[PDB]
Symmetry: C6
Subunit: 228 residues, 6 copies
């Protein structure tokens, strides 16, 4: 991450972190990809950088391998077109005498550009999901002094950003809302957990139950418990 300054830093910094804490195929990352891909039209060079600067080394290597395969697919299609489309593998990858540096890739037509975009995004989706890298839905833990309402919001935020199906997302938040809570709050949730009535939102009850923990009142109570 050196070289003084590139034509764009923030977005690349953000995505790099995003991938590390949410995963290459996460809703969060997929959203940014969608955003940036449809907006800042990219050339094969750009994609080379965008992935290189945001995916972990091994993840990049899978991306690029898949990329190449995707290109090959489209080249078959382009030769099979009637009329044929004059776009070779070299143009789609940004590899060769005619499509090397930015100056040549800058002259790509929208047909080629689009086709590259499609390919890459497919390739991206083909990146193997991390089963171990900061699966943030279970790394977020309540800090010793953090208000439960902040915790939960944080948790949910992460869940929105990592878990794709809302149904599952909901379950996970509920489970983690208990499991990763600090002792101070688990003791409030434990007698509630599993007894929450239908209709009422679970994490909603959980906030209520913990309402007050961390304040003066709570401390006083615990001081009573220390003496008694």
């Amino acid at each position: 991450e050196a070289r003084y300054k590139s034509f764009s830093i923030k977005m690349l910094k953000d995505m790099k972190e995003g991938v590390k804490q949410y995963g290459p195929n996460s809703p969060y990352m997929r959203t940014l990809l969608d955003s940036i891909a449809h907006g800042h039209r990219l050339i094969p060079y750009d994609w080379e950088i965008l992935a290189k600067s945001s995916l972990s080394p091994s993840q990049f290597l899978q991306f690029k391998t898949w990329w190449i395969d995707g290109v090959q697919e489209q080249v078959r299609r382009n030769r099979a077109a009637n009329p044929p489309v004059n776009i070779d593998a070299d143009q789609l990858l940004g590899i060769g005498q005619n499509w090397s540096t930015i100056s040549q890739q800058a002259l790509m037509q929208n047909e080629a550009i689009e086709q590259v975009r499609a390919i890459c995004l497919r390739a991206w989706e083909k990146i193997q999901d991390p089963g171990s890298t900061c699966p943030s839905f279970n790394t977020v833990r309540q800090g010793s002094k953090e208000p439960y309402p902040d915790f939960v919001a944080r948790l949910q935020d992460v869940a929105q950003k990592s878990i794709a199906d809302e149904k599952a997302r909901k379950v996970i938040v509920e489970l983690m809302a208990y499991e990763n809570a600090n002792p101070e709050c688990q003791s409030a949730i434990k007698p509630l957990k599993g007894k929450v009535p239908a209709g009422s939102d679970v994490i909603s009850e959980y906030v209520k139950a913990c309402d007050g923990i961390g304040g003066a009142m709570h401390k006083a109570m615990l001081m009573a418990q220390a003496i008694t």
Copy 2:
């Protein structure tokens, strides 16, 4: 929210958040719309972005559907004018051969622009009110260590920004001032609630009652209660 940088970010970021926490038809959002609509005269492209970047996906879809309908209405009127006004649906939506990109929409006359503004603002108002999305008047809760006066001010601020009729606004603040207070303060308000005499402002009394909570004095008292 990628693509490095647009010609304007802050306002769009603000409104996006605003809609999420106060709602599309809220006084807050409606105020900003009014401000920006009458000021930074907009073209159909702009409106497409302004809504797309601030409304939730489903909300956008309702906006645009309504938008189109609104256009149709005005087109009927324009054809029914004497003399006829040369403004077709294509010009009002920014869809077609003559009114596609910004460069063509930039040449719209003030008659067309205005008409678009009117339409959109009507369309905006036709967006279905969220009955669930962060109804912030009941999401704001007093933090464990927050002074009651800050809480209330916050509450009121939100109420000004979400509840349109002052009469109702007042009631809601009063109710929420008790309900969402932390335990430390509810215990001070509970013996007061419902016994507040006419004339005297309710939340004014509530502040008085809680004056002192959170300081050293309060803690000392509670330490007495811990021992005793």
Copy 3:
């Protein structure tokens, strides 16, 4: 408060807040008006914005009504001049065919400009004093953990900024120094209040009396009181 950016923001933001917390005719606001009016010479358009962006809706409406009246007065005078002065109502309000947009108002002579300034400032002073809007001299309250010396300074600051006659200002600060203090400090002031000897400044004694509240010493004392 949208439209991306105007040729000037901070001053207008400041004044808007100022009016809300101190009042249209307050020493604070009157000072800024004086400053800006004599300095950044203004055209009727500017005044239209300056008031529109800083006065509350109802307050603006009173301003402008009065503005017009003021203009009428000066127009009578201008016609009664010997030689007559060629300045009509249209020029003073910025309303009409010859004095509409900024481009025409930019060509106003200093005689007209001045006359507008005089009018507006008079008009401003004719805005009805709020008897309810954040009368900050009685909204400032001591926070639960705030040192009394900071409180007092704050109070005085506000008093300088809202109360015009120093004599009264002094009384009000003294009264509010007690009344809006937190319980921790009222208990120190109560036995002093009303018994302060002549000559010695009242709030000076009040600081002395409360010197120490909020520190470790104070807490220790109160812990004694909790146990005993």
Copy 4:
């Protein structure tokens, strides 16, 4: 303090505050005057602003009255020169047909400029010392939780900035170090005050004596005192 922006703000803001908290003739203010006067050569207009923007209304009026007198003195000298020096009162004050606006004053010769500088600085020194305005050497007080070493440093800083003769400065710091200390520290200094042996610096001993106040150790002690 409005008018959007002048060609220079920071310095003027600083000096205004400086005068309010240290006084027009204070070492601090006199230092900045010396600095800026010898450096950024000024014209009578500038001086008019520099004083107007930094001295309190009444103080300004005394400045300018004295200014004028000073000019008169130099005009006598200039007429009495051999050869006579062509510098009239109008040139030194920046008042008149030939020396009005900046454009004319910009053409002043260094002889005139200097002479103005000399005059003003003398005039400045003739401003009556405030016997009441924030005599900061006795307004600085130790906060309830402030470390004593910090307090002292602050005190000294102020003393350097307000008291001119070091001999007196030293005495005042020593006296105020005790007098304005918080109760927690006075109790440590009181048994030392007045018994400090010669040679050893007084405030040095005072720091030693209070070393430790405000930490956990100190609190524990005081908790013992609460119970006992």
Copy 5:
């Protein structure tokens, strides 16, 4: 670190600190070198600065000594080429009549530049590893009030940045996670240390064990211990 401003500061500041806290051959430093070397193509002058500004005096001297040796090696190779390559020692070091200042070094060909890069990076790797300078994997210690989860993350971060072989890295983190913990947490880890079952991650258990330390609950417990 004076001279007002160079054409680039941040990176050089970062690396200087990096070398001091992680070491010249650390994964962290080696990563930045790789990044910057392959990206911002450098001339011998640049390398002279890059090392001079980031390596400790003695470390620089070893670098440069090795640098020269490396050059000599390549010069042998260049003379042994068929055809011979016209690159002398003077060109590779940036020393001499033809390759002195930046203006002459700017004209180096990519063959020479590359060759310099290779040399330097080899030379860099030949810098003797510090066995004493801030071996940060054992300087990071848990602060008295720091949550254990933050500590550990910090520790790991440092380990990633200083220890090259992951296998060893893991061991070191585990050992230091106990050893450099504060007393509050060691008492929680001590009964666990060495009894952690296979499969379960060690520092994962360690976090669990310490979950809760530093909160109100923990303090209450300890207050019980104080009394009892």
Copy 6:
């Protein structure tokens, strides 16, 4: 420190403070001098400012006196050269008809410039060491709530920046590490001081001994001591 803005501020601000807290001949100041002198080549005017803006009034006066003497020395040498070197005292000091303002000094040759640099740096070193001005190695004291590890690091930092011979530096840090510690930590070090075994670093042991002070554990202990 007025005059709005010079061509360079930061460095001069830094050095001024540096001299005040570490001393004119300190390693810290000497390092910056070396840096800036060899880098931003200076003219006699610059040196006049650099010293004037960083040395205390009396210190400046000694500098300049010595400066002049140094010049005289070099002038003797220049006249004694074979061939003679055309550099008079006027050129080296920046005093006279031919070498007055920056415009003339800008035309100095590198021979003259260098010679000035040498002179000044020698002159600088001839500035009398302060035996009283903030000898920061004995002004830094541990704050009431500061972790011992931060203290120590701070101390060492200062020692690196003020004490030149490492041998002595080490002793001083060790002594001050005890002496300027707060009571909370002295009580931990006192039983260790002087009994530290050879080989093991002294301040290393001192950190260990104090590890834990300031946390919850420590407070609990002290609460026991309060009751008992």
